[PDB]
Symmetry: C5
Subunit: 272 residues, 5 copies
């Protein structure tokens, strides 16, 4: 790519709106009987014997969408993403401490609120996000494809090197609800045409602390003033928002997600 000048004219600027619903394990709300736990996992438990053999419902996954932009056309125009407004939706729902099956903090008290393990990330790019594979335990037996994991891309069993960084463990984030978060992270050695921002918080009952405001804007331009450039007139948007554990009366525990909203501003750019 050779980046030229910013197009000037009538319709040089456009805006994109959308939302992405979470993919925590029970991914659809339309299924006959299972959909009651939509936006949650099933119960998460150490097995007690080897090896771990987790079910797809216990594997929170990344959200993705390819957004179609107005069609523009070896010298050509491309859409350049310059900024974004993003926000986690439904934060106020987490004040509910009276859910029928909530474990009481102590005898005759309110429920333990959704708290503990958080994971938040969003990404905007002109092509699918690049992913690096790495797991806590290489002997974990993940389901076949279904979710895509390390042994799905290698075509063979994981070895101990997959507890660290293995250059062969790479994939592209092209499918909604299909790449487990505990297996995949953004690959820093690529993603030149993408911008990502993320964080984690561990612990069991750690406070969930979140802000929301319609006045916050993220600038997407790099150090040369270039934003992600959209190949084939497609904008790729990605995220994950785990907001903590639902604590059940029995002692069982499930992870919960929230949806994320996006407003992206783009402009036309000459490239060769």
């Amino acid at each position: 790519v050779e980046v030229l000048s910013v197009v000037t004219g009538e319709d040089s600027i456009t805006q994109i709106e959308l939302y992405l619903n979470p993919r925590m394990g029970v991914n659809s709300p339309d299924l006959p009987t299972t959909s009651n736990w939509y936006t949650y996992t099933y119960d998460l438990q150490p097995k007690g014997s080897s090896p771990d053999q987790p079910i797809k419902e216990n594997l929170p996954a990344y959200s993705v969408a390819r957004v179609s932009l107005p069609m523009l056309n070896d010298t050509l125009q491309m859409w350049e993403a310059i900024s974004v407004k993003t926000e986690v939706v439904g934060i106020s729902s987490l004040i509910n401490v009276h859910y029928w099956d909530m474990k009481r903090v102590h005898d005759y008290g309110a429920g333990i609120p959704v708290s503990g393990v958080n994971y938040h990330m969003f990404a905007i790019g002109g092509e699918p996000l690049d992913l690096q594979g790495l797991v806590l335990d290489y002997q974990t037996q993940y389901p076949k494809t279904g979710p895509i994991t390390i042994e799905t891309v290698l075509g063979r069993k994981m070895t101990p090197k997959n507890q660290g960084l293995d250059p062969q463990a790479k994939a592209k984030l092209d499918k909604d609800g299909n790449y487990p978060i505990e297996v995949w992270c953004p690959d820093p050695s690529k993603n030149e045409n993408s911008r990502y921002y993320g964080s984690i918080q561990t612990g069991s009952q750690t406070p969930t602390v979140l802000q929301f405001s319609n006045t916050l804007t993220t600038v997407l331009l790099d150090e040369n003033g270039v934003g992600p450039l959209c190949k084939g007139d497609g904008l790729f948007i990605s995220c994950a928002d785990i907001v903590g554990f639902l604590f059940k009366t029995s002692g069982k525990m499930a992870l919960h997600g929230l949806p994320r909203y996006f407003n992206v501003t783009l402009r036309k750019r000459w490239v060769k």
Copy 2:
């Protein structure tokens, strides 16, 4: 379409008000009213379905303020606000008569735990999106306005996520539960809102107050919220934590919020 700021003698004004919290016990003059600014006891039943009482549903505060009439017309434009949570100092009380002790012979457990704080300034009612923790919750009929009220029918599993139909406007004080409605980011172009949450059960309540802090309400193009029909809409929620009772029972508590908005006259097409 926005034109030029009005240059004149009396082109700037100041709006000053407060909003008392609406936690469930909403009025201070009832036969009952002893729990004004609190909920009743919050306690998961243990078997389904949940059917919450209206006194256990903290709701948004809102007020419409009438502005001096002005009439291509002139409109009031909000440009900045000073806002403050009132009575923060009251939470040092660790000797409420029926306060659960921290340990034997010790002081009471102070108001702490779940905090929720937001405020909004707009030229029209705040736009709301509905999303609940549990879709099988039996919210009181219309009393409080919830997703069932706006849809006409029962909630579906999809209301545990973002349902595009689950929309409403914050037009009534003490009538929209916080746990059902949050501000809608797909709209609200003529409003500015700011909010945060903190979960946990004994998480310290940590708050600041100062008369030196100002929020600028202008957007990127130098434009504030425009008051159509000479009405400024002010909205807030301020949950400060639980009061812990001897029995083990717990109730949520709120504090009032103070406002001082500055407006200027603006030409519009």
Copy 3:
């Protein structure tokens, strides 16, 4: 009031130094026997039954002083006069280091054979600089609280300013429950906060921290300066040539062997810079 230009001259800038010792409940160190708990409350606890009847010693109050400034004018009849204007302040909490003491003889231990539980839990910190007394708004946790009557030697509370008993509305903001910080150790912190609807000629800064053993986290440095000018470049203006200084610094609980608990507070230092200003 019309603010004019800054006075240009020789002795146009002055400094004002002082400190205020905390008013936690035991407020004097000169008293016969009980003065061993100076800078502390007594033991705080729920009564068990209605209503609460708290004592003086269990009620931390705000500290305050009026400081007399050098007189500026040789004629008061003039429409235009010089007034002192506070522009900046250095302020610090004194004795923060003392809180490393985990060997008070009657300290509850963290566990068997261990050190004492350090001063921790509830914190409340505020200070104000103004050209008049700080404006206050009354608000309480529980309106049924029976505070000692001011006539009986007690502090000043909401009933005191209303002439009658509190009602359920005093758990919210009640326009009638207002007062002014003019006596040192007489306005209880749990009753009165600063009034944001007034206080245009004062600057206030504050915070709270709840929880029972929450860490006390505090900073100190003689390099920190708070600018006192408003958005128009005008600081508090000293009417009657008096500068009012207010504060409150609760730093946590002292945990006694039996399980009983008292709040503790620290003194505060101020150095205020003032300039001369013309007013109409």
Copy 4:
């Protein structure tokens, strides 16, 4: 080593990408005890003296010397001006269903990785300078294996080694050989390196970490000079302890993650 002007030209700028896998104790994935790669063994106070820690319970610094292109009295040197760095695999720490994980309570999820964190990275034109200091001087470290204060002194530690001893100094020249708990960056040297670190103590303290491809560190000092690579060698160093793996039995092991680097360099004239 007097610094002159920045070299102007076509190929005056170059970029170095690499990653380093963590060295927690079990350091190779190729040995057979390698299934504990990126972890220590079980850390467990004995209850009586002395402490004789095994080499698998001593997380060490990661390091690489990168060979830069040939450049050549006055000569050209590579100067490090900026770095993009990121901790890799942070999302793996959401797993709370490891087969032998201790539960938070009955029927509950496993306790997530948390507690003790230690993060640091350094970019330099030469090896990083180290200072020795230990919790307890009586600790019997394994003999050379790991390089410790006794190794560099010849004789045994004394009580002064619980504070700063100017004789306890070393150079970070070997990957997985210098124990984090013995060696810290030496602030009295390191003029030709930049370093950044932090620690967090506690047992179940949350692990709180960020990642973004938008963050850059500027390596220039106050005079506008970055580290200068002597003999064309760039030294990259790091450590990233992310907390404890809590096991069913009561036992606990420390865990580490890998760190990725993209470093920008320019040619500089020196005398």
Copy 5:
């Protein structure tokens, strides 16, 4: 009266040093097995408190001799002026040690409880000794006598017994940090009403098991200039450097607890300044 910066070849100097902590066991040259620690800290259980010197962490301090400048007791003179400092706590990484043999296990069969809890961090740079204020938790506490090997406390500088006012701000209880290991932290804080010729920076963290959280970097610099652009002026050609760095508790198997401290390094930059 502060005049102009002296312009020349050798008008700028740099001063380097470290300070080892004074936690109670202050020498490594013996009982020195507990150097950089206190002894065991325990509420006595009965009145009054009579604490041993090994249980009183104290401030570190050093005077540094600077090059002689005035080759003459004149009206106008050259003085060294401190303008910036790089400072750093040393040995932070040592606190990842969770296997010390005597470290209390978090739970049955687990790792030790790390060093954590009470933290106190301060550093100062000045042209004269740091000015101190005395204030104590309990005025009844009986600190050991100075002439019997012990530290300097309020009783020492008063020449009479502490009273209840010493639990607040008493203006008569003031002093100078002119001795290392002699002034206890729990007794003395920096006096904000003086120290016009010093710059101090401090903080505290209480609680029993609070995470110790510290940063280290050779890129961080503190600017020592006041609002008029003047650094501390070294009269008598002496530079005063002070500090304290308590990093938490060592939790012992038996339940007993001791406080721990770490060393601090300083790189100060100074220039020559004309003064009246």
